[PDB]
């Protein structure tokens, strides 16, 4: 257990160490920031340990120490909160506020806050059923015609689902010396590695290692694989492709070229079409390779 005196001292040592590190790096201590602390500690004490928390850290003692101690009543003994004797003053105060807003309204991409972090916000342990009751009240408040104060109040209790997998990197459009717009991309299948350049305008000519695609790929299966990207988005005969493939075999080279052309063609199509290609599996590297 960490006494408040202990945390006070550690704050002092952190401040003096911050000025010391600022002196060592030559930066001005007055404007020296926490990002500077992290960067300087990484430089002075290099560590490639994969666990980021196992690497050297000099953070402000407030973030490190889990010491908490909240006083609920004064010297006279009177509790500060009017719901103290319930034992869950924070939770019931929140419920009271929500019910009052619901009364007022009656007179007139994201996820719900999970139980443990609701406890963290309230700094009070709570059960499953009361959490369900609170979530039901929040849903009821959403159902009503929530005004401003209501929906930022609800937004206090809604986290962000930052797992949007529609994050394909659209290659920038480049321009050749002739002024023609194009886009370059890479792809890999087994040991085959391909790099394709797709032109914005063309007549459907594909050149594989300087050779026509029907001559470089005698087998119809490879030609169908080269078709799949352009056909999926209804632009066969509307682009020119210049690709270079190396390594692997016939099927691996065809798959790598397909991936490269799809990733380069992402530039000239709409975001919806990019998502349709992604859901069709045209923009994912195949990770299946020979096993030892």
């Amino acid at each position: 257990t960490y006494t408040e005196d202990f945390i006070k001292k550690q704050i002092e040592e952190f401040n003096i160490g911050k000025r010391h590190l600022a002196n060592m790096m030559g930066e001005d201590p007055e404007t020296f920031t926490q990002e500077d602390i992290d960067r300087a500690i990484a430089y002075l004490f290099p560590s490639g340990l994969f666990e980021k928390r196992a690497r050297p850290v000099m953070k402000h003692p407030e973030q490190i120490f889990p010491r908490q101690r909240a006083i609920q009543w004064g010297e006279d003994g009177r509790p500060f909160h009017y719901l103290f004797y319930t034992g869950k003053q924070s939770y019931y105060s929140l419920m009271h506020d929500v019910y009052g807003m619901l009364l007022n309204l009656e007179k007139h991409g994201s996820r719900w806050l999970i139980k443990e972090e609701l406890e963290e916000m309230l700094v009070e342990k709570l059960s499953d059923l009361d959490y369900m009751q609170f979530i039901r009240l929040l849903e009821k408040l959403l159902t009503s015609q929530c005004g401003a104060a209501e929906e930022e109040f609800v937004q206090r209790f809604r986290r962000s689902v930052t797992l949007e997998s529609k994050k394909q990197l659209i290659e920038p459009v480049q321009y050749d010396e002739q002024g023609m717009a194009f886009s370059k991309s890479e792809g890999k299948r087994k040991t085959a590695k391909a790099e394709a350049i797709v032109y914005k305008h063309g007549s459907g000519r594909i050149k594989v290692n300087g050779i026509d695609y029907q001559l470089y790929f005698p087998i119809t299966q490879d030609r169908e694989q080269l078709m799949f990207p352009f056909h999926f988005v209804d632009r066969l005969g509307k682009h020119d492709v210049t690709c270079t493939v190396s390594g692997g075999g016939r099927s691996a080279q065809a798959g790598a070229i397909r991936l490269a052309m799809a990733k380069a063609l992402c530039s000239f199509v709409t975001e919806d079409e990019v998502e349709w290609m992604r859901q069709a599996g045209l923009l994912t590297t195949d990770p299946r390779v020979r096993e030892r």
Partner: protein, 191 residues
């Protein structure tokens, strides 16, 4: 006894505290640095007694101020690149031959490395005064050592133990190749 970090001022000359590469000394480093995967409801371990901080190759003896203050004193040992050689275009004009040699720095009692003897001479045939027959003969004689795309002849010598001996061997090989390319045998008449 108390650590000497307590006596260090906030405006000290840090390079004097760590003049050279030295291990992490928690009684000498005035930082409250912590490192270690914390336990449940715990904190990363403190520096005093931390073997993990002692295992890092710390760069405390190389700070930006220390680096500047060192390389400012080391300027006296340097010479100036000839300003006439502004780019590689004139480097390949005034100094045709390129000699590549490698040194290896490992850690141990022995400084020897078998790979330090290799020498690579690179010269563009266009820099050598060869007529049509001479260049044909030299190209056919060298074989794959000549790359047609780059017009460069690459002679790699590693037979001799030392490196000066291999450099001399490469020079002698180039000398013979040139002289024997500028020679026509009675045999060479009827190509």
């Amino acid at each position: 006894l108390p650590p000497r970090t307590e006596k260090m001022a906030v405006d000290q000359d840090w390079p004097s505290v760590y003049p050279v590469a030295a291990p992490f000394k928690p009684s000498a480093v005035p930082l409250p640095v912590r490192m270690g995967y914390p336990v449940k409801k715990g904190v990363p371990m403190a520096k005093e007694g931390n073997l993990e901080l002692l295992k890092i190759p710390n760069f405390l003896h190389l700070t930006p101020v220390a680096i500047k203050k060192h390389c400012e004193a080391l300027k006296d040992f340097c010479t100036e690149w000839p300003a006439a050689l502004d780019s590689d275009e004139k480097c390949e004009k005034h100094f045709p031959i390129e000699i590549d040699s490698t040194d290896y720095v490992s850690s141990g009692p022995s400084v020897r490395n078998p790979r330090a003897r290799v020498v690579v001479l690179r010269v563009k045939l266009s820099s050598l005064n060869l007529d049509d027959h001479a260049k044909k003969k030299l190209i056919k004689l060298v074989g794959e050592r000549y790359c047609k795309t780059t017009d460069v002849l690459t002679i790699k010598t590693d037979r001799c133990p030392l490196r000066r001996q291999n450099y001399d061997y490469a020079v002698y090989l180039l000398t013979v190749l040139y002289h024997e390319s500028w020679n026509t045998e009675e045999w060479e008449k009827s190509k």
